[PDB]
Design a protein around this ligand. Structure first.
Ligand SMILES: O=C(O)CNC(=O)C(=O)O
Ligand SMILES: [Cl-]
Ligand code: NI
Length: 365
């Protein structure tokens, strides 16, 4: 007799379990200290909690902004993805109907909205991602405004979760990093380090037919518990395997981004999700396109280095090597035309690869 993940009993069982504190792993940092220099010094390999939004350059509405306000600014008629936590099955419904449920007393069901991207709505102007995210983000820096392919629509999510909701262990799509801001309520994260063997266990667990009957954290050494409270912001690094529990009704904002400190992990995660073939619904759209733009940027940086007389930093050269490898796999004979759909206009992949390979050789000397 197995326990279904996200069921009433599961939650009761999970609430009772003791986990190691995120204390020893999650750094608490004031917003003004979260700079590019800080990220480079530490490598953004561990999650970071910023207890107050001051200095982050994050814009969000006041905590007097309610789910009812979300309905108004997003649009009552908007189709949204709703997860039935007690079944771990998703469905579609008008936001109006979810909001109706949310304000119901005697909720029979445990339902959440965790995929509402609002950048195309009136609510978009009320939220601006942290400055550090804009500084790190490959799309923000390298995807041109006049591009014929649409930017990955992953920059502004509104998360609405009722008390006792649960999101099972996962790695976010594209191995993207995340910022996560709790506006009202609190959100508990269960964090697992993306050590290589953990990643492999994760892939095997997730590919198993009975994954919903198995608590993944049982298979790893350390799963850290991190409570994120009202007004706090959590930055989750590339590749981290995590689940969440919602202790009280919670409203949160989040966004996802790729960056130059985790090229290797981004590719490893992308490779895993492609073998899993999930149709994630939360997929990082045009991950490959963002990588092509990064690759073009790196080539320009290499060429520029000859005029500046200053070498690119080692992690960028290593990043270039990893990207060039991916570029080769995506354009191989058998490498499909699913891959060609993600190539930006005006790209000559075989020429880019050859030019990057040469610049890398020159740089290494
Ligand atoms: O909000 C939650 O409980 C879970 N959200 C995520 O996993 C995410 O934003 O990527
Ligand atoms: Cl990005
Ligand atoms: Ni997630």
């Amino acid at each position: 007799k197995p326990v279904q993940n996200g069921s009433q009993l599961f939650i009761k069982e999970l609430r009772s379990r003791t986990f190691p504190s995120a204390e020893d792993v999650v750094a608490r940092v004031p917003g003004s200290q979260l700079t590019l220099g800080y990220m480079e010094e530490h490598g953004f390999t561990e999650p970071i909690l910023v207890p107050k939004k001051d200095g982050l350059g994050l814009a969000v509405p006041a905590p007097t902004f309610y789910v009812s306000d979300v309905e108004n600014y997003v649009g009552p008629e908007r189709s949204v993805d709703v997860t039935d936590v007690t079944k771990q099955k998703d469905c579609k419904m008008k936001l109006k109907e979810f909001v109706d449920y949310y304000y119901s007393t005697n909720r029979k069901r445990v339902l959440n909205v965790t995929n509402l991207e609002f950048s195309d709505t009136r609510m978009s102007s009320f939220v601006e991602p942290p400055d550090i995210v804009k500084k790190l983000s490959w799309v923000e820096n390298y995807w041109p405004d006049d591009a014929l392919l649409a930017k990955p629509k992953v920059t502004k999510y509104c998360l609405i979760c009722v008390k006792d909701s649960y999101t099972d262990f996962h790695i976010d799509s594209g191995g993207a990093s995340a910022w996560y801001h709790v506006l009202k309520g609190e959100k508990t994260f269960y964090l697992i380090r993306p050590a290589s063997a953990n990643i492999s266990l994760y892939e095997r667990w997730r590919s198993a037919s009975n994954h919903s009957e198995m608590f993944f954290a049982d298979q790893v050494d350390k799963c850290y518990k991190c409570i994120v409270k009202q007004g706090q912001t959590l930055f989750i690094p590339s590749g981290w395997i995590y689940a969440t529990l919602t202790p009280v009704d919670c409203l949160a904002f989040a966004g996802h981004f790729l960056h130059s400190l985790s090229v290797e992990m981004q590719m490893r995660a992308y490779e895993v999700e492609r073998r899993l073939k999930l149709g994630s619904l939360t997929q990082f759209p045009n991950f490959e396109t963002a990588c092509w733009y990064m690759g073009k940027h790196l080539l320009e940086a290499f060429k520029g280095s000859h005029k500046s007389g200053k070498q690119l930093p080692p992690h960028l050269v290593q990043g270039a090597k990893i990207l060039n490898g991916a570029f080769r796999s995506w354009t191989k004979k058998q490498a499909l035309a699913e891959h060609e759909d993600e190539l930006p206009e005006h790209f000559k992949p075989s020429q880019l690869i050859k030019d990057l390979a040469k610049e890398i050789r020159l740089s290494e000397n």
